[PDB]
Amino acid sequence: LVSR
Amino acid sequence: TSALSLSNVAGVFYILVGGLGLAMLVALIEFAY
């Protein structure tokens, strides 16, 4: 969720 | 040692989920800007  | 000690770790599970909420909170300001 944080990366993409 | 009859006790399985299952409630306490559910407590640290609650603080883990809290930490995930804060993590998402930082994730929002990180994806916004």
Curated annotation (Swiss-Prot), chain B:
Induction: Down-regulated in the pyramidal cell layer of CA1 in the hippocampus by global ischemia. A lipid is attached at A32 (S-palmitoyl cysteine). Palmitoylated. Depalmitoylated upon L-glutamate stimulation. Ubiquitinated by RNF167, leading to its degradation. It is found in: Cell membrane; Postsynaptic cell membrane; Postsynaptic density membrane. Detected in forebrain. Detected in dendrites of neuronal cells. Expressed in the pyramidal cell layers of CA1 and CA3 and in the granule cell layer of the dentate gyrus. The chain crosses the membrane at residues 9-29. The M4 transmembrane segment mediates tetramerization and is required for cell surface expression. Ionotropic glutamate receptor that functions as a ligand-gated cation channel, gated by L-glutamate and glutamatergic agonists such as alpha-amino-3-hydroxy-5-methyl-4-isoxazolepropionic acid (AMPA), quisqualic acid, and kainic acid. L-glutamate acts as an excitatory neurotransmitter at many synapses in the central nervous system and plays an important role in fast excitatory synaptic transmission. Belongs to the glutamate-gated ion channel (TC 1.A.10.1) family. GRIA2 subfamily. Homotetramer or heterotetramer of pore-forming glutamate receptor subunits. Tetramers may be formed by the dimerization of dimers. May interact with MPP4. Forms a ternary complex with GRIP1 and CSPG4. Interacts with ATAD1 in an ATP-dependent manner. ATAD1-catalyzed ATP hydrolysis disrupts binding to ATAD1 and to GRIP1 and leads to AMPAR complex disassembly. Interacts with GRIP2. Interacts with GRIP1. Interacts with NSF via its C-terminus. Interacts with CACNG2, PICK1 and GRIP2. Interacts with GRIA1 and SYNDIG1. Part of a complex containing GRIA2, NSF and NAPA and/or NAPB. The postsynaptic actions of L-glutamate are mediated by a variety of receptors that are named according to their selective agonists. This receptor binds AMPA (quisqualate) > L-glutamate > kainate. This is Glutamate receptor 2. It comes from Rattus norvegicus. The lineage of its organism: Eukaryota, Metazoa, Chordata, Craniata, Vertebrata. The gene is Gria2. The chain holds residues 805 to 837 of 883 of the full protein.
